């Protein structure tokens, strides 16, 4: 049983960060070094584990979360970061054990005129908790008056478009991100 990371890393479609995907992987064997040695990743940052060992450490289930952000936001997908993404979209715990892997996806995920498909959350009444998801699209009440389903003054659509344009600077081009979270408990994933 080889772990199906192929379905995660090489999927034809990803997600907006606000609606980040999780694939739960357990009961399988995987070659982490096949991943670690791939030249196709521009970022591969790990916390609590080295890429060259992963084949040897076992774990009780791994969660693989995935989404799309801009290049200049990849630094927010790390422990202890702040910002719109970490605060209102996808927060990592302080005690994160695992890796953050990103690569430029401009060739796949950009569209002439701007992509309208990928969104991020602009506003929320409070910061997200670690590994929380919020997929509501309720009109945001910024003032003293209920919106009752109508957008306008102090009644804001909570999502903003990334508008990924093929001609964007690398900082503003789309990057695909996979976060591997390793959990230990009783009794799995293991190497060859």
């Amino acid at each position, epitope marked *: 049983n080889l772990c199906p990371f192929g379905e995660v890393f090489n999927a034809t479609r990803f997600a907006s960060v606000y609606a980040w995907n999780r694939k739960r992987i357990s009961n399988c064997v995987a070659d982490y070094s096949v991943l670690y040695n791939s030249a196709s990743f521009s970022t591969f940052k790990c916390y609590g584990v080295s890429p060259t060992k992963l084949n040897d450490l076992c774990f009780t289930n791994v969660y693989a979360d995935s989404f799309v952000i801009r290049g200049d936001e990849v630094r927010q997908i790390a422990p202890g970061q*702040t910002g719109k993404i970490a605060d209102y979209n996808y927060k990592l715990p302080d005690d994160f054990t695992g890796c953050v892997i990103a690569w430029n996806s401009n060739n796949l995920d950009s569209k002439v005129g701007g992509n309208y498909n990928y969104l991020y959350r602009l506003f929320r009444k409070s910061n997200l908790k670690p590994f929380e998801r919020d997929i509501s699209t309720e009109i*945001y*009440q*910024a003032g003293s008056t209920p919106c009752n389903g109508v957008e306008g003054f102090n009644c804001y659509f909570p999502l903003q478009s990334y508008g990924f344009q093929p001609t*964007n600077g*690398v900082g503003y081009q789309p990057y695909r991100v996979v976060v591997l979270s390793f959990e230990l408990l009783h009794a799995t994933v293991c190497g060859p």
Partner: antibody
Amino acid sequence: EVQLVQSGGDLVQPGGSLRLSCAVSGFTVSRNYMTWVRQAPGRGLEWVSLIYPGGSAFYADSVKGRFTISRDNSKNTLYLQMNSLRVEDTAVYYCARDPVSTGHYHDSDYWGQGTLVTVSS
Amino acid sequence: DIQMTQSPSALSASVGDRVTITCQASQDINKFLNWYQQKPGKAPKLLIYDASNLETGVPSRFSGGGSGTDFTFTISSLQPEDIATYYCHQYDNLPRTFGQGTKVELKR
């Protein structure tokens, strides 16, 4: 309508401290973006700090550590804590909310009346 | 930081002349550039947001455009009520920065 009022500024000394107030009428402060900007004596405009609606706050590369930004949701008022004041911080100060441009909506930014702050001893 | 270089420092023109101010960024800021107008001793106001779009109430004679590093501002026909000091401001790459400013001046 919408209005912002700034107060609590006067002469201080090097190493002193001063709190700036910015009352708001029209929108809830705790649920909206907000920033402070610095208008030097007869010179350009300078960004000081911002606070995301939800807690997170960010400062300039000079007021960092020396300054702080906060808010009180009851009185619905904004506050700028300026500690270890230098002369280089002597200027006018403005409180404003970030412009909006979600989906099929767009609105400008609202600014306060501005308060003068002097550090010279 | 992303420094913003705005030209010209001083500008004097007559009524009806088209005026083009400029603001370059040291790094790509995409379309997240706002142009502000400040009249002598008063709070600045937002005219052009998202580097091109006009805010409500802004006359059609104001227009701007650009994406990336170089950014352009322009009034097609100068009006006496347009005499002020204009600044460029990026707001997507923290820390936020402004421009030095351009003082529009009438020509007698």
